[PDB]
Ligand binder design. Structure first.
Ligand SMILES: [Zn+2]
Ligand SMILES: [Zn+2]
Lengths: 715, 244, 123, 245, 82, 209, 114
DNA sequence: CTCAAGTACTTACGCCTGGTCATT
RNA sequence: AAAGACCAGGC
DNA sequence: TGAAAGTACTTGAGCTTAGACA
């Protein structure tokens, strides 16, 4: 009965399907929760699920409560027959039973229609499993043959067969990926007040020092000003490291991968040496500072006394040194860990040994390892991606690897600088100024009439403003063209884009010269009607004798004019931008992350724009669009606009997105190696025959990859 | 088989009762090789001479004698794809064709007759290769299969009363696919034919038994509706390898 | 993008020939004697005759007189300058002739609307 | 073996082809002879063809067998002996009270302005055959034979079947237009009602037809090689059962 | 390069360990004199492992740098990973 | 409209002066942060039939190391720049005896214009920049990392430290937007410093060819 | 809006302009025939195409056994209780899930949307 | 002579088991 | 028997 | 009965002129 309003960006059918899917998914989730709540502790399904050996909660839901909605190609079961799913159903039945929602569970048994719909649903998984494997294997082979010769030389510089430098140090830190673990910086995020309370080592208290430090060391700490100066220097260096971290890690992501687990070995030192937190420690804080400073010298990724070598070593070990100084802070040692001196020495020794073990072994075949570590998750990745829709999984990985000139769904996320970021009206204004709106999108109907004299007005409603306009010293006396093009502008589309007839007429004049008459109904009416003629006459001259053959009679000339206006008018926005979406993100990667006056990380919900089709240059040039955060998923235009290093970063981001979308994790060094070998020769080298054989490698290297005889002929 | 097009491989709504949904090979040929359902029958072919002769005898109009001005309201008549003419009273023509096929006087039970009401076309197919399955016939809200038919079939031995006599009695009808498009089926008679909360009242056919949609290998599965469909497919493809 | 130059050439060649011979036809008329038009001798807006601007000024004057016999303003002497200033504002805000006329007609309605709203037509 | 159903009209839409909507009819004549002769009737998308298309999407064209490239639908209709545009429209459009479909078929009429005679239409088609005839009459004969025999043989093959062919082609164009209006759903290839199954019967028939044709060809060759003497002829040594067996 | 100014890791890579153990085991199985004393060890692989643990393997590893130079590290000079 | 072109000119001038500052040329601090109103007052608002004619918007700057080489920014008035325009503008170029200058095209250049631009390498060097490309500072984008142009001594030290021949380094074509931004010719090496989530900071060197 | 045909050669009439009198003329280019154009309009384009479907809806659709029918909404003309309903059933119909009812019972054929 | 807009090549998982058939 | 093709099947 | 795409080729087009000074 048409009470369902269309959600913006979706047709009424799309919104209806979304509502039905939401209802059915909520029902299935509620039934699954109710069923799992009813399982006793002795239930074997629950015993298997909680152990994680096999099965899941949705498996118990399907077995016990409800199988759930069956989907074909990411949508509810289609109408294979004429507007009906099966002959048993009436035509145009969108109910849950007719469209494939299985009310029964596996235990209860499916009804025949539900059985057939479940067969259709399982056919999707069967086809995906059978068909994605070939393309995944081909992708793995291409990646391998691209990276097969990339290796870590004995100076730890990652180089290919031609000794060309791919990375100065493997993983940009020079260490292998087997020994690293996840760790928290614990310096990035803490409120400035909390940071100072946690890492300052306030020695003025004279009671906390007695409680935590031994009685002998308290007098030494207080009396000597050199102790206090060194401690304040340590805290200043830690604050500088905090600033460096906040520069390196926006969005406040404190989970990082580092070679050795500081907290775990601190705990091991506590247990090995029988450390009692209830008692004051015998560890001198200056001894902690000196041990940290000395240990930082023995953790060498880049050896050498050159200033270049010193800077390379500092940059390679910067993050790990920051984390180590954060965890090995004097105040943390005295307050939380309470480590003893001998325990601290043993901990330093273990840190040095484990970090030296974690260093990547020269001679390690890093290229093939990274290619396999990239291709292996592709096997478990779905071939399908199914209201912004972006290609994910194997097809998106293929698009990124080949750098397809025309991606299937090229999108361009947009961030807003000023008040448009927060206010919805200005965000909609930017939306309308970015979305391509030609004349056809706004006019309701257009027609070509015949008006031999303007005052005639063969259309009745136009008499008023027509007799208003032609009663001035105008060109009516001469042969005003009797052919009239009358267009009707749709009020809804008129006000949706905040367009007005003055803007449209200005665009018409700019595009078609001053020799085209445009007359409109200054709104405040009932039909946003616009009248346009093709006035040329002959400037009041003698008739017309022997007119040129290609006169293009005004009726069909008006035909061409109307077609050109309806097709290529570009009233607003930027071309190759089919549709722009607008929403407030709930995920932190698209949220605005700022540093408060307290130093904390807070996320602001600001309107962002996702576009179908990409034009990065003009969108970035556009007013009030954030030039720093705006980016697109396709790589070719990023190469043509922002450069090659921006391509490196954006390609790394796209690969990380397509890999971690399903929740999987792949160590960063493999992604970095792939992006570096693609962005190495200065241009976007594709992982394929054209680009792998375009390198200046050996002919026998190329002849093993997809060309053989051709490469040997060229050689 | 090397083609990556995943659309032809998909199980279609159009395969209901026609091809077994669960049973299909695994590998590069999934979905592209299909085995017949239990009740599925292939049209063998027939010469469309008697149907054309009856249509000529049943009024209608040829294309050579037709007036192009009076063809808009009338319904086109197609026989084996060729256009033979138009008819101004599709309802009675279809009713008489159905009666003749039910009693098997001029039209054999293999021939399929379709009335596409929205598009005003009537298609009659006598071609070979069409896939069809038998279905019970429903008049009003009651089956045409009565107690006496079952009583005579119980004594099928030494009676000379068989499936052919049941079909010739106008009780069961062979309905192919594109005629199944214009049919409305009932799953079981004791549930969907009797009066309840009104869903449909224009039932014209009722399935013999829903288990007939399964193939030869998928029919041996006990309680196949309690299984995940991929596992039914696996068991179907594996039963051919069972040893005995 | 290829069709853009194609359509531009086609349109320009098929409507240029429509102009015919002797395409000079400018004959810019100066303000005759007493045009109440600030910067009247202005060629910024092509094909905007001085008499057309005078006609728009008279239309604005009739609108202001209708507002006068709906709200009882001071007199007509200041209304003449009011109409002149409104016409000059519209002229500055306009770039092409038809847009200028459209803006002139848009003001006239606003006025009449205020007269229907019975309120004086303020700035 | 699965295959598309023969002698019926299908409408499909390709995503990147120069055709917006394509109608085809895989046609075979009673399975008596020839594998299949299939005909396409399509609409030329939206991109301009130089000077005529400036509307909602039109220019229906045909792809005849043994013709290298497209042929306008109105030219093909005129090649069947239908000169006046009203008769062609009556065959294509069944009711003239619907103006939108007429508006869409209008520029197809506009293209065939130049060709206004049946014989010149036949020459237009014949000049676009497999090989252009040197003389006008050879092209006329070739085009007439292609239109009569190979193009849509299921409706008719012999002589006066021209009216039936025109009616069926009009039905094809009507279905294509109905797809263009969106009044009919695009036909689904995977819909099994559009598929026929070639079992032992049809497969062995297709085999035996060609095999018996080869047997007859060999018999003719032997007869020709043995008749030049003029002595006599005997069938028993002229037949090689090895062929069929 | 010269013995002075050697730049590689003093740790021996696992690949160097594997290859040196294989080579030493092959030499031992081909009647080469054993360096460490053997306590009833008939298997050359365990003999080579014991030799490595005692840093007595008479092999120097020539580490080729990517620029074409090389550096000679004795197994005793390299410090065992295990 | 006219205000749109005024904002376009202001943004282009701001980006151009930031570009000149990044290349080591003496740019006053006030000029780098120039508000739209300040630029409007300085150059006279509307450019169409107004004070700024796209001439006298040109910028002359001097390099910090030596004030003699200088650099002098360009703004042709024509939508498409031709041989005559660059010819008279090079007559100015030789009159002022400077060598380095830019090119700010509205839409595009004739092929003869490009050929004449590349004709003299040693005498005068001129770089062609589109109007659209200057509407944003690509170096300020979050994807683009910090680029530093290395002197010849730094390049020699870098090659001696890692014992690399010149072609063994990673490459960056001279047509790269960032390479064009710094006006880098073939044979130079750009030092690239980008943050990493494994090491914290990573320095990459890209030879320009 | 529509298409008019010649009466001599039955070809299509194209719009022509009568220069001497300034009236719209429909002149066939196959011959010399010219006729007065009554509507004075040539081309109408409803790109948003707010077209009514009931003009494209045929009455015999009510004979379909596969279509649902309710007695809730009666006929406006004949007041018959039972009526068959269905959706747009048409492509390019924008976004429309509205219901098009057709009255059952013979010879009625009435249709209405709500 | 010299730029964008049409026509040709070239490739689509890893094995593993077997059975059949026409040429040689 | 040799390599060639085809087919079916396992993961 | 229904690839899909990337790359290496061609081919056509096609744009003011005037003499003095310069
Ligand atoms: Zn005529
Ligand atoms: Zn009624």
């Amino acid at each position: 009965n048409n009470e369902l309003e269309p959600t913006p960006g979706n047709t009424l059918r799309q919104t209806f399907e979304n509502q039905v899917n939401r209802i059915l998914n909520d029902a299935r989730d509620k039934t699954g929760s109710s069923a799992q709540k009813s399982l006793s502790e002795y239930n074997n399904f629950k015993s298997m699920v909680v152990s994680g050996a096999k099965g899941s909660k949705i498996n118990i839901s399907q077995v016990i409560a409800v199988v759930g909605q069956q989907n074909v190609e990411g949508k509810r079961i289609p109408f294979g027959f004429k507007h009906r799913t099966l002959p048993h159903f009436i035509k145009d039945d969108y109910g849950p039973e007719s469209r494939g929602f299985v009310e029964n569970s596996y235990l209860a048994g499916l009804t025949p229609t539900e059985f057939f719909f479940h067969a259709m649903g399982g056919r999707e998984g069967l086809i995906d499993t059978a068909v994605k494997t070939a393309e995944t294997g081909y992708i793995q082979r291409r990646l391998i043959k691209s990276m097969e010769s990339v290796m870590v030389k004995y100076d730890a510089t990652v180089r290919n067969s031609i000794n060309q430098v791919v990375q100065l140090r493997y993983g940009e830190d020079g260490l292998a990926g087997e020994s690293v673990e996840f760790q928290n910086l614990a310096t990035l995020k803490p409120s400035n007040k909390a940071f100072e309370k946690k890492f300052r080592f306030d020695y003025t208290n004279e009671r906390a020092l007695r409680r935590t430090l031994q009685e002998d060391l308290v007098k030494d700490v207080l009396s000597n000003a050199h102790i206090q100066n060194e401690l304040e220097r340590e805290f200043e260096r830690m604050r500088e490291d905090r600033e460096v971290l906040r520069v390196i890690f926006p969005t406040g992501d404190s989970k990082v991968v580092l070679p050795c687990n500081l907290l775990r070995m601190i705990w091991n030192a506590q247990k090995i040496f029988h450390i009692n937190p209830r008692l004051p420690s015998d560890l001198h804080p200056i001894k902690v500072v000196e041990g940290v400073k000395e240990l930082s010298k023995k953790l060498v990724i880049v050896n050498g006394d050159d200033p270049l070598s010193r800077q390379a070593q500092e940059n390679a070990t910067l993050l790990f040194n920051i984390h180590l100084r954060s965890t090995l802070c004097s105040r943390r040692m005295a307050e939380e860990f309470r480590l003893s001196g001998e325990a601290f020495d043993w901990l330093l020794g273990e840190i040095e040994s484990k970090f030296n073990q974690a260093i990547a072994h020269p001679g390690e075949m890093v290229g093939a390892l990274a290619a396999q570590s990239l291709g292996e998750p592709a096997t478990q990745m779905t071939l399908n991606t199914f209201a912004k829709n972006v290609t994910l999984g194997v097809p998106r990985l293929k698009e990124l690897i080949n750098i397809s000139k025309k991606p299937k769904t090229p999108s361009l996320t947009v961030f807003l600088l000023g008040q448009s970021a927060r206010d919805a009206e200005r965000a909609k204004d930017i939306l309308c100024r970015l979305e391509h709106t030609t004349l056809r999108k706004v006019t309701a109907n257009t027609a070509i009439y015949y008006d031999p004299n303007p005052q005639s007005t063969v259309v009745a409603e136009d008499q008023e403003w027509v007799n208003v306009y032609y009663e001035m010293p105008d060109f009516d006396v001469a042969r005003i063209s009797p052919w009239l093009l009358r267009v009707e502008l749709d009020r809804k589309h008129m006000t949706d884009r905040k367009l007005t007839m003055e803007q449209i007429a200005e665009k018409i004049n700019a595009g078609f010269g001053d020799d085209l008459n445009c007359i409109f109904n200054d709104d405040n009416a009932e039909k946003l009607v616009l009248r346009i003629r093709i006035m040329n006459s002959d400037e009041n001259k003698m008739q017309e004798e022997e007119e040129v053959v290609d006169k293009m009679d005004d009726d069909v000339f008006l035909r061409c004019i109307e077609s050109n206006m309806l097709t290529d008018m570009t009233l607003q926005g930027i071309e190759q931008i089919s549709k722009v979406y607008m929403h407030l993100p709930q995920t932190d990667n698209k949220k605005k992350i700022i540093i408060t006056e307290d130093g904390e990380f807070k996320a602001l919900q600001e309107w962002i724009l996702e576009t179908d089709g990409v034009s990065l240059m003009r969108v970035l040039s556009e007013k009030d669009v954030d030039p720093v955060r705006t980016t697109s998923n396709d790589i070719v235009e990023i190469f043509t606009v922002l450069g090659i290093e921006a391509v490196r970063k954006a390609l790394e981001r796209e690969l990380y997105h397509v890999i971690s979308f399903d929740g999987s994790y792949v160590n960063y060094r493999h992604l970095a190696l792939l992006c570096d070998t693609m962005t190495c020769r200065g241009h976007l080298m594709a992982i394929t025959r054209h680009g792998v054989n375009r390198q200046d490698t050996g002919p026998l290297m190329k002849c093993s990859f997809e060309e053989t005889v051709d490469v040997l002929m060229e050689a | 088989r090397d083609g990556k097009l995943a659309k032809p491989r998909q199980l279609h709504n159009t395969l209901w009762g026609m091809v077994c949904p669960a049973e299909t090979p695994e590998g590069h040929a999934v979905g592209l090789v299909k085995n017949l359902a239990l009740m599925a029958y292939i049209s063998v072919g027939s010469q469309p001479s008697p149907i054309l002769e009856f249509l000529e005898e049943w009024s209608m109009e040829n294309l050579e004698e037709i007036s192009p001005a009076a063809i808009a309201d009338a319904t086109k008549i197609f026989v084996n794809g060729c256009w033979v003419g138009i008819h101004k009273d599709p309802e009675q023509l279809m009713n008489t064709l159905r009666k003749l096929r039910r009693q098997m006087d001029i039209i054999v039970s293999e021939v399929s007759m379709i009335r596409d009401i929205r598009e005003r076309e009537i298609r009659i197919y006598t071609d070979a290769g069409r896939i069809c399955r038998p279905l019970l016939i429903v008049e009003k809200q009651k089956l045409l299969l009565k107690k006496r038919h079952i009583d005579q079939l119980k004594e099928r031995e030494y009676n000379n009363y068989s499936w052919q006599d049941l079909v010739a009695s106008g009780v069961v009808e062979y309905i192919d696919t594109l005629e199944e498009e214009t049919v409305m089926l009932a799953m079981t008679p004791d549930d969907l034919q009797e009066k309840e909360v009104a869903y449909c009242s224009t039932y014209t056919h009722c399935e013999i038994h829903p288990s007939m949609i399964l193939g030869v290998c998928a029919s041996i599965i006990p309680f196949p509706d309690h299984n995940q469909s991929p596992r039914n497919t696996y068991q179907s493809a594996m039963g051919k390898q069972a040893m005995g | 993008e290829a069709h853009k130059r194609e359509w531009n050439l086609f349109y320009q060649k098929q409507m240029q020939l429509r102009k015919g011979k002797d395409p000079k036809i400018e004959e810019f008329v100066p303000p005759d004697e007493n045009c109440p038009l600030k910067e009247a001798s202005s060629r910024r807006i092509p094909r905007l005759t001085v008499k057309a601007r005078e006609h728009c000024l008279r239309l604005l004057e009739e609108a202001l007189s209708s507002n006068r016999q709906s709200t009882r303003t001071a007199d007509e002497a200041d209304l003449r300058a009011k109409a002149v200033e409104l016409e000059h504002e519209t002229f500055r805000n306009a770039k092409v002739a038809n847009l200028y006329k459209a803006s002139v007609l848009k003001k006239v309605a606003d006025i009449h609307r205020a007269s229907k709203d019975g309120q004086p037509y303020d700035m | 073996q699965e295959k598309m159903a023969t002698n019926t009209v299908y409408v499909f839409a390709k995503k990147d082809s120069k055709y917006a909507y394509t109608g085809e009819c895989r046609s075979c004549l009673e399975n008596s002879s020839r594998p299949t002769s299939t005909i396409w009737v399509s609409m030329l998308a939206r991109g301009g063809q130089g000077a005529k298309k400036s509307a909602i999407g039109q220019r229906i064209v045909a792809t005849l067998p043994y013709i290298k490239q497209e042929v306008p639908i109105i030219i093909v209709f005129r090649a069947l002996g239908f000169v006046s545009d009203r008769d062609i429209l009556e065959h294509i459009i069944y009711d003239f009270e619907d103006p939108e479909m007429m508006e869409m078929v209008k520029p197809s009429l506009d293209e065939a302005f130049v060709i206004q005679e049946q014989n010149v239409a036949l020459n237009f088609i014949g000049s676009r055959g497999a090989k252009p005839g040197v003389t006008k009459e050879k092209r006329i004969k070739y085009a007439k034979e292609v239109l009569q025999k190979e193009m849509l043989p299921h409706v008719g093959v012999s002589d006066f079947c021209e009216t039936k062919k025109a009616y069926f082609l009009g039905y094809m164009v009507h279905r294509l237009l109905l797809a263009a209006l969106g009044r009919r759903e695009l036909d689904d290839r995977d819909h099994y009602g559009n598929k026929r199954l070639d079992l032992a019967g049809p497969l062995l028939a297709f085999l035996f037809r060609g095999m018996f044709k080869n047997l007859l060809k060999e018999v003719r060759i032997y007869a020709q090689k043995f008749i030049d003497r003029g002595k006599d002829f005997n069938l028993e040594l002229a037949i090689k059962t090895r062929i069929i067996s | 390069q010269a013995n002075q100014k050697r730049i590689t890791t003093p740790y021996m890579t696992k690949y160097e360990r594997a290859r040196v153990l294989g080579t030493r085991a092959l030499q031992i199985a081909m009647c080469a004199p054993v360096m460490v004393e053997l306590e009833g060890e008939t298997d050359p692989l365990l003999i080579a492992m014991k030799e490595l643990k005692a840093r007595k393997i008479p092999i120097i590893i020539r580490r080729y740098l990517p620029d074409g130079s090389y550096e000679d590290w004795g197994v005793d000079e390299l410090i065992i990973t295990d | 409209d006219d205000e749109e072109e005024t904002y376009r000119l202001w943004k282009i001038r701001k980006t151009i002066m930031q570009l000149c500052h990044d290349r080591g040329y003496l740019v006053t601090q006030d000029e780098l942060d120039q508000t739209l109103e300040e630029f409007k007052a300085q150059f006279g608002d509307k450019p169409s039939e107004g004070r700024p004619r796209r001439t006298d918007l040109t910028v002359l700057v001097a390099h910090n190391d030596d004030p003699t080489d200088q650099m002098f920014v360009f703004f042709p008035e024509e939508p498409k720049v031709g041989i005559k325009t660059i010819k008279v503008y090079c007559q100015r170029m030789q009159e002022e005896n400077i060598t380095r200058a830019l090119i700010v095209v509205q839409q595009g250049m004739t092929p003869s214009a490009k050929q004449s631009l590349v004709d003299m390498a040693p005498k005068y060097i001129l770089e062609q920049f589109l109007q659209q490309e200057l509407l944003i500072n690509i170096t300020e984008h979050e994807l683009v990392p910090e680029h530093v142009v290395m002197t010849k001594e730094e390049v020699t030290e870098l090659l001696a430290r890692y014992k690399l021949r010149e072609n063994q380094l990673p490459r960056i074509q001279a047509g790269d937007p960032v390479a064009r931004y710094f006006g880098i010719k073939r044979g130079q090496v750009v030092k690239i410093i980008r943050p990493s989530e494994t090491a914290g900071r990573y320095i990459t060197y890209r030879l320009v060819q | 809006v529509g298409i008019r045909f010649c009466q001599e050669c039955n070809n299509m009439l194209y719009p022509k302009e009568d220069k001497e009198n300034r009236i719209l003329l429909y002149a066939c280019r196959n011959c010399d025939y010219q006729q007065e154009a009554d509507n004075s309009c040539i081309y109408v384009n409803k790109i948003t195409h707010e077209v009514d479907e009931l003009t494209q809806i045929i009455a015999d659709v009510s004979q379909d056994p596969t279509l649902p029918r309710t007695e809730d909404h009666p006929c406006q003309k004949c007041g018959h209780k039972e009526a068959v309903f269905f959706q747009s059933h048409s492509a390019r119909a924008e976004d429309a899930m509205r219901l098009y009812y057709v009255c059952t019972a013979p010879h009625c054929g009435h249709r209405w949307t709500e």
